[PDB]
Amino acid sequence: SMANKPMQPITSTANKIVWSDPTRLSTTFSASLLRQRVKVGELNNVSGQYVSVYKRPAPMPNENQSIRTVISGSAENLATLKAEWETHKRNVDTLFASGNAGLGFLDPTAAIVSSDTT
């Protein structure tokens, strides 16, 4: 079946790029990065802000469906921050992708997991 439509960078700065669908210009994904020295008791924190926007017809006006993720941790521990992102997705999936959290309701019995293993 079909490939996903490619998006093109429309604004491009060292620290922030905005991609949009050239045939649906309201569809956007942007990435903005902030690197900062932090003393922990000497690391370089990177805070990455990732934002997806889609304009969706109400079943007439469009609503803004938006997803904003911020990932924040030292570059030095980027290996484990990757594992944190994996587990974050998995835990979000549990509630929203295959649960009812997108309807506004939490499942108290959801199997939420750490990045650590037994």
Added chain:
Amino acid sequence: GSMANKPMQPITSTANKIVWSDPTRLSTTFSASLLRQRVELNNVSGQYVSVYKRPAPKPEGGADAGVIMPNENQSIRTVISGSAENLATLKAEWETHKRNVDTLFASGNAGLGFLDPTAAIVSSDTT
């Protein structure tokens, strides 16, 4: 190696917010906070936050010397906002967002603080 991710237990609860933590490492938390609102659509904003206290790397010769390093805070927050009416497409947007973040962060260099302007970013729409 192990695929047995440690289970986390709800420690605080409200109708709109649960915090889960690892009972063997209580500083590891995952929280889900949801707000539903009539606005005619029923908007839902869900905020999902992951926290780990991660030892900074030991310097050269640190293991030998028995150094225990202080922890940093590794945090990931996602906020998903859209009407319950279009939840199905909102789920498709979540799959796509994960994909686009993976391109830059999971297998790119965005976690080092640098963007690849040639990265293959895609819409949830198909051709």
